[model samples]
Target: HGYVSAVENGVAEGRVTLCKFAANGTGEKNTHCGAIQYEPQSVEGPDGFPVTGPRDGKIASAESALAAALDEQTADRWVKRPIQAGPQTFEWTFTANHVTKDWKYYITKPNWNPNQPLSRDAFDLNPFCVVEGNMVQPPKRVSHECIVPEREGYQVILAVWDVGDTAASFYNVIDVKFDG
Candidate 1:
């Protein structure tokens, strides 16, 4: 099981699995950072179209029962990491890394409404970066360079790690602010 641990060399500000502010500590019962789903369905579909994964309103929460707080949508609600728009590195830490299929990164549209729950229509259809996984075990710390899209103000980047041997995928949401 794994989740995105950081972005652009900084720890995730909105990651649900091990949120820094989680009250009950790591795991599912933590209020600030709820236990995340390790085996959620894949969001990628045919021809790079998003067809599955947690339903529209629950993407950030990974449709987990304890992670509902992540679904709360607002521009200024979640703490955001300030980052520039361009090539960026995302880091992942795994407890038990499994064989990987591939990694994909998607970002919110410039015109997306932060007041509404995250949905497929809110992001670009194709990922900004797609790193092919060779079905081998990756190091405990895996980093992927993805070119972030140009956008002002706030946005959410969805990082997906698909397991090669399973139908499961790990989802992580990074809330960020792009300097204008």
Candidate 2:
């Protein structure tokens, strides 16, 4: 179990609050961050794509009532990581070295409304980057190079880490600012 430790060179805003394990004998305190907990089954549609995980408006909070603050949406809300377009690395710190299926990076659509709660429609269907794990135990600290899609000012990047063995996945949302 884990949450994104960093995106590019910036630390995840909720890293300290996100739990590594859901108090499942891991000796870690549960933060009630639903994304860090293991769900019985992964959300896969008939088309073999993730229909959704967490919920529409509660994605950033992983649909956890306790971590609801993370789902606040506004143009100026939350700290943002400054970055440029093109190549950048995203880093993850895993508490449990579960075998991974893949990591996907999805960005908010260029025309998305920042004032509204985040929904699946807010992001582009095609993720900007997808790194395959090929069903192997991942290093505690994993880094993936992803190309940041071009966008004007503020944007949100949704990162998903799919567990290969379990039907669970971890989620993290990175707020970012595109530098001119």
Candidate 3:
């Protein structure tokens, strides 16, 4: 089960790798509002970071059960806006500057639900973009353009920084309402 509501506490510095709402419990399907919303606030904190569990969970891991970082009332009333179409940009910074094996991007199925636990079946099996592990990777910051899939409305776009020669992999999820 999930939080079933938004968070009153601020969730700064954390993320829900599942749906890209920074906050864990945020939703995509408009069941509560009839349209996806993003207004409550950005929920980030330890609660939402490193959003992964057992390797077998894939996307359905226990990691997803954490409550959304944003408060419930606000998330229900938050305004969901549409972003740019294909070729959107995402940026991230690394602290240790580890060698990178690859940078990858993935997208979710059209109108996937945010309120439920996530699963690998929720997204495409293959990454939309990939940076070869053999390529030179920037240490301070990493930027990449993700080509949005041919779908629209409230959705998720996920990025992964696969650390070269290491088990550590960093990720980011953009909770997006696409204009495409």
Can you write out model 3's per-residue Cα lDDT over 19-129, one digit (the tens) per residue?
333333534432232111232111212122124422322332122224233222222333343455566555554445556667676777776666544455566757777
**Model 2 per-residue lDDT tens digits across residues 1-180:** 655654344333322222432221223333433442343112221112348466678677665544555666877665555667888877776667788899888888998998999888899969999999999999877778888878998888887788888766666777777853
Output the number of the lDDT-best candidate.
1
- At residue 77, candidate 2 shows an lDDT of 64
10-114 per-residue lDDT for model 1 (tens digits): 334334543543312222222344443332222222222268667788787666675677788877666566677777777776777789889888989998999
Deviating ranges (above 4 Å) for candidate 3: 1-82, 133-137
Please provide the root mean square deviation of candidate 2 (C-alpha atoms, Å): 7.0
Show the colliding residue pairs in model 1. Answer: 28-35
Q: Highest TM-score among the candidates is held by which one?
A: 1
Give the CA lDDT, 0 to 100, for residue 122 in model 3: 61
